[PDB]
Design an enzyme around this catalytic site. Structure first.
Site, mmCIF file in Angstrom:
data_model
loop_
_atom_site.group_PDB
_atom_site.id
_atom_site.type_symbol
_atom_site.label_atom_id
_atom_site.label_comp_id
_atom_site.label_asym_id
_atom_site.label_seq_id
_atom_site.Cartn_x
_atom_site.Cartn_y
_atom_site.Cartn_z
ATOM 1 C CE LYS A 105 -3.641 2.257 2.834
ATOM 2 N NZ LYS A 105 -5.034 1.963 3.380
ATOM 3 C CB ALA A 157 -5.989 -11.787 0.648
ATOM 4 C CG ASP A 160 -15.413 1.160 6.576
ATOM 5 O OD1 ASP A 160 -16.641 0.991 6.382
ATOM 6 O OD2 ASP A 160 -14.743 1.700 5.674
ATOM 7 C CE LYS A 202 -15.903 -1.194 2.808
ATOM 8 N NZ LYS A 202 -15.578 0.199 3.160
ATOM 9 C CD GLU A 251 -14.776 -1.826 -0.748
ATOM 10 O OE1 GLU A 251 -15.571 -1.737 -1.693
ATOM 11 O OE2 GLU A 251 -14.362 -0.832 -0.122
ATOM 12 C CG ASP A 300 -10.163 -0.154 5.322
ATOM 13 O OD1 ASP A 300 -9.367 0.797 5.507
ATOM 14 O OD2 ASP A 300 -11.324 0.100 4.963
HETATM 15 C C1 LIG Z 1 -9.525 -0.779 -0.016
HETATM 16 N N1 LIG Z 1 -9.997 -1.259 -1.332
HETATM 17 C C2 LIG Z 1 -11.465 -1.117 -1.520
HETATM 18 C C3 LIG Z 1 -11.756 -1.959 -2.784
HETATM 19 C C4 LIG Z 1 -10.560 -2.908 -2.916
HETATM 20 C C5 LIG Z 1 -9.725 -2.688 -1.636
HETATM 21 C C6 LIG Z 1 -10.205 -3.680 -0.557
HETATM 22 C C7 LIG Z 1 -9.811 -3.288 0.839
HETATM 23 N N2 LIG Z 1 -8.393 -3.608 1.039
HETATM 24 C C8 LIG Z 1 -7.791 -4.691 0.563
HETATM 25 C C9 LIG Z 1 -6.509 -4.667 0.933
HETATM 26 C C10 LIG Z 1 -5.573 -5.694 0.659
HETATM 27 C C11 LIG Z 1 -5.484 -6.555 -0.460
HETATM 28 C C12 LIG Z 1 -6.217 -6.559 -1.671
HETATM 29 C C13 LIG Z 1 -6.551 -7.671 -2.341
HETATM 30 N N3 LIG Z 1 -7.227 -7.346 -3.415
HETATM 31 C C14 LIG Z 1 -7.349 -6.022 -3.488
HETATM 32 C C15 LIG Z 1 -7.984 -5.213 -4.440
HETATM 33 C C16 LIG Z 1 -7.977 -3.827 -4.296
HETATM 34 C C17 LIG Z 1 -7.327 -3.248 -3.210
HETATM 35 C C18 LIG Z 1 -6.699 -4.074 -2.249
HETATM 36 C C19 LIG Z 1 -6.710 -5.467 -2.396
HETATM 37 C C20 LIG Z 1 -4.458 -7.471 -0.173
HETATM 38 O O1 LIG Z 1 -4.080 -8.359 -0.940
HETATM 39 N N4 LIG Z 1 -3.956 -7.238 1.042
HETATM 40 C C21 LIG Z 1 -4.643 -6.186 1.581
HETATM 41 O O2 LIG Z 1 -4.454 -5.677 2.696
HETATM 42 C C22 LIG Z 1 -6.327 -3.520 1.711
HETATM 43 C C23 LIG Z 1 -5.259 -2.950 2.374
HETATM 44 C C24 LIG Z 1 -5.423 -1.777 3.083
HETATM 45 C C25 LIG Z 1 -6.662 -1.133 3.099
HETATM 46 C C26 LIG Z 1 -7.742 -1.687 2.435
HETATM 47 C C27 LIG Z 1 -7.561 -2.869 1.737
#
Ligand SMILES: CN1CCC[C@@H]1CCn1cc(C2=C(c3c[nH]c4ccccc34)C(=O)NC2=O)c2ccccc21
Length: 281
Positions: A39, A90, A133, A135, A137, A151
């Site tokens: 990130k 993931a 938060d 959910k 997602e 998140d």
């Molecule tokens: C925050 N985004 C909203 C839509 C997609 C993504 C989902 C939430 N999210 C996935 C995250 C992560 C992963 C994601 C795995 N698939 C994703 C697709 C879009 C964004 C992030 C990811 C991952 O492999 N490891 C994660 O921590 C993530 C990390 C920090 C804050 C939010 C995070």
């Protein structure tokens, strides 16, 4: 400790997703072949929009967690322009994806995934931390199809940062809309919405816009569709309760014991969920 990592230590690949303050990009560490979801946050934008408290909380909270149902923060580093958080990747995406893909879950899958969320929240709330938060997602699926919650910038670490954030409308608890106040109850509310969504395929409070969703929430205006697994309906009714102090899992309701002891979870072995093979579609 290891040497601080640097951008040049990785081969960055695909963008996973893009938010207002961050971008998550897949990265392969040259020296190890390991893939990480990194990130990346622009320092200027965070400073301009007063987000340092949040970026600081995300790192600090994730650093304190050590449990398999959460995304791991492995490392952090920064260059002159950006901050970098090395997270678990993931492989199987978000639970939202899976809900959209296969439609609504049969009772066995509902139960398994609900039990891993309850068990994660028990760990989190034991550390005095509120997600705020929760959910689908932000409930990720690993390679072995266990959950990994992420998140945490918007989380709250409790006392002995009060009431500034409001999560995704569909999961917002009545007390956030009426009081200025996040509590453990608010995560338990979101849990109720998520259980309803796994069974029903869609969340319980829905409308055209956020105003109308919030009106439904404060009036508790939702319904169960007809074949809704009866014991699960009972569990959802015991979570989606306007009085926050009367939700299953709350301190006033005697904690996670009663929640884990609900009929819906009668067949669950709570002690080693992460060691159990998840049911497969
Ligand atoms: C925050 N985004 C909203 C839509 C997609 C993504 C989902 C939430 N999210 C996935 C995250 C992560 C992963 C994601 C795995 N698939 C994703 C697709 C879009 C964004 C992030 C990811 C991952 O492999 N490891 C994660 O921590 C993530 C990390 C920090 C804050 C939010 C995070």
């Amino acid at each position: 400790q290891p040497r601080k990592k640097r951008p040049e230590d990785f081969k960055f690949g695909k963008i996973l997703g893009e938010g207002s303050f961050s971008t998550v990009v897949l990265a392969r560490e040259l020296a190890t072949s390991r893939e990480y979801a990194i990130k990346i946050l622009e320092k200027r934008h965070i400073i301009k929009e007063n987000k340092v408290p949040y970026v600081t909380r995300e790192r600090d909270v994730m650093s304190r967690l050590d449990h398999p149902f959460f995304v791991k923060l492995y490392f952090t580093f920064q260059d002159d322009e950006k901050l970098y958080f090395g997270l678990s990747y993931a492989k199987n995406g978000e639970l939202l994806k899976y809900i959209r893909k296969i439609g609504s879950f049969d009772e066995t899958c509902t139960r398994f995934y609900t039990a891993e969320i309850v068990s994660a929240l028990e760990y989190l709330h034991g550390k005095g931390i509120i997600h705020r938060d929760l959910k689908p997602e932000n409930i990720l699926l690993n390679e072995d199809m266990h959950i990994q919650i992420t998140d945490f910038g918007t989380a709250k670490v409790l006392s002995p940062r009060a009431n500034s954030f409001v999560g995704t409308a569909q999961y917002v608890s009545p007390e956030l809309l009426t009081e200025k106040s996040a509590c453990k109850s608010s995560d338990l509310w979101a849990l109720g919405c998520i259980i309803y969504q796994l069974v029903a395929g869609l969340p319980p409070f829905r409308a055209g816009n956020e105003y109308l969703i919030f009106q439904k929430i404060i009036k508790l205006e939702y319904d169960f569709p007809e074949k809704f697994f009866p014991k699960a309906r009972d569990l959802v009714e015991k979570l989606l309760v306007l009085d926050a102090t009367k939700r299953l899992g709350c301190e006033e309701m005697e904690g996670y014991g009663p929640l884990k002891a609900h009929p819906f979870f009668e067949s669950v072995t709570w002690e080693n969920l992460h060691q159990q093979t998840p049911p497969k579609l």
